Nucleic acid binder design. Structure first.
Lengths: 95, 57, 93, 68, 104, 262
DNA sequence: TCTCCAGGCACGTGTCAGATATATACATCCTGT
DNA sequence: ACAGGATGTATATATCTGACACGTGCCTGGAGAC
């Protein structure tokens, strides 16, 4: 058995230690089509364009998780909250 | 015009596949020389049955 | 004739790491990086040419643009190597 | 395909090397008789097919098997 | 006769970047030292990146160059990260960093 | 043209009975031409030119292709080996989805090996067969092989075996072969281990196989006699022999029994 | 701007890395007796 | 708590495919003179 917090460090090491994609492909492709048909209907998409969208949102989300964790330590806490996300979005500049 | 073009494309693809199969079936299904002798800038002594030679420099 | 920088960075990798190979995704990384640096430096040199009522781009504008783009140690090493290459090319006699 | 053909056609070839199961299964080797086993002691089943490829129909002389 | 790249002692082409500068409409007049200066700068930058990438690939004890090694070389170096603090990477990953108090 | 004609007639008799047969004789008397005569007789009897499957080790794959071309050239020969693009082209060649009897079709004979059949179990899961032949089937003697698992999932229901020596006697390949012949009622090997021991095994497999030997016809084949040559070890070979005896696996003994340069 | 040729790309042919087996012992492990 | 039968290991082989490599024909943009 393990104390609560050691296996979390083990899997956080495993997730930082690897390079695989973490988002399921078919829900993302469906999301891209359903978010694109409002702008222009009956569109066609390239597979590497979906891969580019995949890697862009992965990099954006993990960088967002860095500075929202920085907001979490700044408020003397561990768990992130929604005000940490709003603070990170405001201090990044966008609204 | 589209059906004739599709039939021609199917005939060309079948002909290419048959030619590839025929080519694959037809293509897939000593004394040793002497040592080099050289003599540059070297005098020659030569000896036949009837006369002797001496090619000097 | 789709044009790319593959052979040149293959050899300059080969003069220092002979038993090493490149992946194709990595191959694309170096190609895109070279093209991005080229675009940034060339548009800064054109902006600096349009600065001074000057219709010609020469080596001095690109030296100033290299000193503007790069960080300092990269900048001083880049202008040192580029000056050596220019003096090699100019004294072709 | 052509090594077996060159073995069965040319008579000037003298030595035909082999592994255990590489050519001791179904290969027609009736042009020779003397099989020589360097270390074939693994199982009798493997060796029973080994001279089966040589001691076959079409041999015109006596077969002398040498086990070393 | 012979190319200008060997005249200036480089491996990157000179006429190619001269062409790409020409109809790239940056200016209507382009001097002669411009492609050799750009060529030497690109030489040095590619050589430095390839040096650090080969060191990271050898550091992985693995005989090819994988973009994880490119990410390691980009973010481990100080001013290469400063030059490339904007560009997102393909199949590179994230450098391992844990904040100090999360360790118990 | 030999005495295998009555044997193939008896094999046709068990084929008409409705169960699979066993050929448990050594190679040398022409089991290959016997199998091609079985195919010719069944193509003359039931008028079938269609699905025939052949799994053979690759050393004699080209050989039995060659004697198929030299003996009976009336059928259509299609191979299966090589690179994956040629594999896709040959997959296109029998992609007609034909069923039952066919006359003008290129899949009259289909020749392959064990290992890429084991690799292409998804591609061989479809295209249900009518007659499959396993040549030198001693290689799946273990029941734990993945090739056994892929060879237990066909849709042909015909298990003719061509094996020189199925008497490997490792207490499980016998159960493997009898489960291969009848796949319905032979499943619990512990009960067959449970079900005087020298005599009582003679009648169990007797009506399935037939007893043949090489010493029944004229023998100009050579009449192979044995010369077991013995020799003593050299001082170097015995020296490293006693050295690794003192330091202390059988291959370490036999490789210095072969050459010290190993 | 004219002449021009070869460097560089599209598309072919081979090479170990890895996987998978066989076999004869001992070694060890897990479970039931 | 021990024995007996399962896998595990080792140390060689063996065959065989996979994902890389290298080598070649041939055009259009580089080089030279002006």
């Amino acid at each position: 058995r393990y104390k609560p917090g050691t296996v979390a460090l083990r899997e956080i090491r495993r997730f930082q230690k690897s390079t695989e994609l973490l988002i399921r492909k078919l829900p993302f492709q469906r999301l891209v089509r359903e978010i694109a048909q409002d702008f222009k209907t009956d569109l066609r998409f390239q597979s590497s364009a979906i891969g580019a969208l995949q890697e862009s949102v992965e990099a954006y989300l993990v960088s967002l998780f860095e500075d929202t964790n920085l907001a979490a330590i700044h408020a003397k806490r561990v768990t992130i909250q929604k005000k940490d996300i709003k603070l990170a979005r405001r201090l990044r500049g966008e609204r | 015009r589209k059906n004739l073009s599709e039939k021609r494309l199917e005939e060309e693809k079948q002909d290419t596949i048959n030619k590839l199969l025929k080519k694959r079936a037809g293509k897939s299904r000593f004394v040793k020389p002497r040592r080099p002798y050289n003599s540059e800038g070297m005098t020659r002594i030569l000896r036949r049955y009837e006369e002797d030679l001496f090619c000097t420099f | 004739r789709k044009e790319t920088y593959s052979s040149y960075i293959y050899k300059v990798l080969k003069q220092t790491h002979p038993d090493t190979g490149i992946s194709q995704k990595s191959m694309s990384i170096l190609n895109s990086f070279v093209n991005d640096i080229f675009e940034r430096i060339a548009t800064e040199a054109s902006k600096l040419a349009a600065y001074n009522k000057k219709s010609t781009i020469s080596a001095r504008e690109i030296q100033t643009a290299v000193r503007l783009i790069l960080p300092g140690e990269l900048a001083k090493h880049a202008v040192s190597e580029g000056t050596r290459a220019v003096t090699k090319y100019s004294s072709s006699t | 395909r052509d090594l077996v053909h060159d073995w069965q056609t040319n008579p000037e070839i003298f030595v035909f090397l082999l592994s255990t199961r590489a050519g001791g299964l179904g290969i027609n080797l009736t042009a020779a008789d003397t099989v020589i086993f360097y270390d074939s002691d693994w199982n009798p089943t493997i060796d029973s097919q080994a001279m089966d490829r040589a001691h076959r129909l079409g041999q015109t002389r006596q077969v002398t098997v040498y086990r070393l | 006769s012979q190319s200008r790249s060997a005249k200036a002692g480089l491996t990157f082409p000179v006429g190619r970047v001269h062409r790409l500068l020409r109809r790239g409409n940056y200016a209507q007049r382009i001097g002669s030292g411009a492609p050799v200066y750009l060529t030497a700068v690109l030489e040095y930058l590619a050589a430095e990146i390839l040096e650090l990438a080969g060191n990271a690939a050898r550091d992985n004890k693995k005989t090819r160059i994988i973009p994880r090694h490119l990410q390691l070389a980009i973010r481990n170096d100080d001013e290469l990260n400063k030059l490339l603090g904007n560009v997102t990477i393909a199949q590179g990953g994230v450098l391992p960093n844990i904040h100090q108090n999360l360790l118990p | 043209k030999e005495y295998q004609l009555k044997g193939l007639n008896w094999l046709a008799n068990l084929y008409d009975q409705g169960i699979n047969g066993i050929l448990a004789d050594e190679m040398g008397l022409g089991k290959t031409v016997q199998s091609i005569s079985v195919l010719a007789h069944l193509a003359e009897n039931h008028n079938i030119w269609g699905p025939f499957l052949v799994v053979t080790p690759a050393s004699t794959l080209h050989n039995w292709v060659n004697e198929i071309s030299k003996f009976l050239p009336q059928f259509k020969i299609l191979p299966y080996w090589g690179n994956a693009n040629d594999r896709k082209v040959l997959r296109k060649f029998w992609d007609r989805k034909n069923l039952r009897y066919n006359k003008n079709a290129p899949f009259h004979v289909m020749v392959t090996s064990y290992q890429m059949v084991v690799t292409d179990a998804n591609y061989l899961q479809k295209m249900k067969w009518q007659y499959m032949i396993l040549d030198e089937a001693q290689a799946i003697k273990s029941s734990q092989s993945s090739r056994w698992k892929n060879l237990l999932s066909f849709h042909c229901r015909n298990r003719l075996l061509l094996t020189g020596t199925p008497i490997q006697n490792s207490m499980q390949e016998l159960w493997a072969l009898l489960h291969f012949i009848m796949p319905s009622l032979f499943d619990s090997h512990d009960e067959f281990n449970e079900w005087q021991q020298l005599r009582r095994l003679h009648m169990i497999l007797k009506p399935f196989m037939l007893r043949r030997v090489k010493k029944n016809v004229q023998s100009e084949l050579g009449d192979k006699i044995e010369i077991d040559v013995l020799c003593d070890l050299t001082q170097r070979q015995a020296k490293l022999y006693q050295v690794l005896k003192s330091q202390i696996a059988v291959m370490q003994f036999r490789k210095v029994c072969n050459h010290p340069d190993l």
